[PDB]
Amino acid sequence: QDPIRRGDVYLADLSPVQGSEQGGVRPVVIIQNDTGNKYSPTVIVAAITGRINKAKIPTHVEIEKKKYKLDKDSVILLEQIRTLDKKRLKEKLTYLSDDKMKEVDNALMISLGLN
Amino acid sequence: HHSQDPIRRGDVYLADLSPVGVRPVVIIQNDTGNKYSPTVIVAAITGRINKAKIPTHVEIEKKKYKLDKDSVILLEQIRTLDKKRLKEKLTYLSDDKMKEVDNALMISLGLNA
Amino acid sequence: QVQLQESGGGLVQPGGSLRLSCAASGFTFDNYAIGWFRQAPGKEREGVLCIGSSDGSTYYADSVKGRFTISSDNAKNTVYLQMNSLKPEDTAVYYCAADPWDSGYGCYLDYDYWGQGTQVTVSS
Amino acid sequence: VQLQESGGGLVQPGGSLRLSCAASGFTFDNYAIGWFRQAPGKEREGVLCIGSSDGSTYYADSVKGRFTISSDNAKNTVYLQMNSLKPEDTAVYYCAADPWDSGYGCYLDYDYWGQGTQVTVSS
């Protein structure tokens, strides 16, 4: 099937002991390199929150509800990063634009002190 | 007394990672967040292997870093942790070793040009 | 919704003290990020004392460390900026700001709520 | 040996071989497994490699659709089924295995390496 691609936006089961526990299925962005995304059992993701619609700290990237088929105008939290078993990935909502992915890269560099 | 010395990028802490624990981890988040944020970002350290197996791995030797055995930093295994989960500071990485972690983190996260 | 209002500014002599209050016309500062800013004519607005999460650490501008501290009342509807050892460089309009997203740290790039500002003037 | 390859030989372009990889003292259960080949004068190359069974198999570009891997139920043997062999495939083939199966692709390092078996494609 279609490879998980860096920059894709997925619904992901973040519920601890996920199975089908609660409403812990939230949008995330794939930030892992595409070689791991193709062969690894795991991916690395950044959280997306609708709790805010405006960047509050330098690790935030805003994303529009309409273009990216979200339930709210949201923010990518590059300070909230986690490695995820691929079995926790549900549906693929969309993918970020190349310009939007560049904002994510820059915020990732800030977040992890990579300059 | 809880040491007010600030958490720094490259520090090696013992951390409570349950659930998927207490294991060593490397702080990889920027030092401004490390000073003020409720959370840090860490990469896992494992003694299950003693040699880099994939390009996201960085080896660290037991004696230099006060480890129970030769270990590997897994830059494919990243997690954001509440600071409460950090226990004791074990040690911190050399400048060259940290440069290797940066490189493996750029590979892991697809940031290299 | 809410509307923040600063008070307690005014004129003080060098070395003097001043307590600014930031009162919330609607909410309590529970689980709210809180920032204190100042803006002097000709100068850029400057974050002076900012709290994101209570599980984080307070940010202080270098120039105010040791002199400015924050505290809140019992009702948690009032936060105070205690300003001691005031200097002529501290003259400015002072603003409080708050935001419901209390998962960050430092002075935020954006706050949902701002005050109108209160003037602080340190003159001899 | 602890890893021994077999099942290689000569075959004409288009033929098939099934290389064996026998484990002694341990089973392949939850092991990363890699098949590698080394041509004359060229550096050893990864051909088909499995890290985690929850990940995906890596194939060298030339070998996808021709080479597949399988186990021996008892998991004491691993097989490289090599179909549609081309002269480019002439080399010594090795199997390698590692107890750490949380990775993916061909590992930079394997704890256990076989001795090698010769494969030649020509007619």
CB D28 within 8 A of CB D22: no
**Domains: count for chain B:** 1
**DSSP 8-state code for residue D92:** E
Q: Is residue B1 in some structural domain?
A: no
Inter-CA distances, D27 with A5, A13, B53, D31, D106, Å = 34, 34, 20, 8, 19
Cα–Cα distance measured from residue B12 to residue B31, given in angstroms and rounded to the nearest whole number: 14
Q: Check B48 against D104: CB less than 8 A apart.
A: no
Cα–Cα distance measured from residue D116 to residue D111, given in angstroms and rounded to the nearest whole number: 15
Class of domain C4-122: mainly beta
**Domain residue ranges of chain D, discontinuous segments joined by +:** 3-121
Kind and range of the H or E element at B35? helix B31-36
Experimental method: X-ray
Which residue does chain C place closest to A61, by CA atoms? C109
Name, in order, each residue with C-beta under 8 angstroms of D13's C-beta and a sequence gap of 6 or more: D85, D86, D87, D121, D122, D123
Return left, alpha or beta for D105; rule: phi > 0 is left, psi -120 to 50 is alpha, else beta.
left
Contacting chains of C (3 CB pairs or more, <8 Å) are A, B
Q: Which chain D residues touch B53 with a CB distance below 8 Å?
A: 32, 98, 100, 103, 107-109
D112 touches chain B (CB under 8 A): no
Inter-CA distances, A55 with B40, C54, D59, Å = 19, 20, 42
A72/chain D closest Cα distance in angstroms: 33
Cα–Cα distance measured from residue A75 to residue A52, given in angstroms and rounded to the nearest whole number: 6
Q: Check A52 against C101: CB less than 8 A apart.
A: yes
As given in the structure block, the two tokens for residue A72 are 């709210």
CB B25 within 8 A of CB B10: no
CB B47 within 8 A of CB B70: yes
Do chains D and C touch, with touching meaning 3 or more CB–CB pairs less than 8 Å apart?
no
As given in the structure block, the two tokens for residue B29 are 């988040």
Please state the φ and ψ torsions of residue A37, each to the nearest 5 degrees. Answer: -60, -25
CB D101 within 8 A of CB D52: yes
Test the A interface: residue of D52, D57, D64, D106 with most A CBs within 10 Å: D52
As given in the structure block, the two tokens for residue D67 are 């080479």
Cα–Cα distance measured from residue B55 to residue B101, given in angstroms and rounded to the nearest whole number: 11
Pairs of CB atoms within 8 A across A/D: 26
Nearest Cα residue to A10 out of A79, A61, A85, A60? A85
Name, in order, each residue with C-beta under 8 angstroms of D8's C-beta and a sequence gap of 6 or more: D17, D19, D93, D117, D118, D119
Class of domain D3-121: mainly beta
B51/chain D closest Cα distance in angstroms: 7
CATH number, domain with residue A7: 2.30.30.110
D87/chain B closest Cα distance in angstroms: 30
Residues of the domain holding B98:
6-113
- In the three-class reduction of DSSP (H, G, I as helix; E, B as strand; rest coil), residue D39 is classed as coil
Q: Is residue B75 in some structural domain?
A: yes
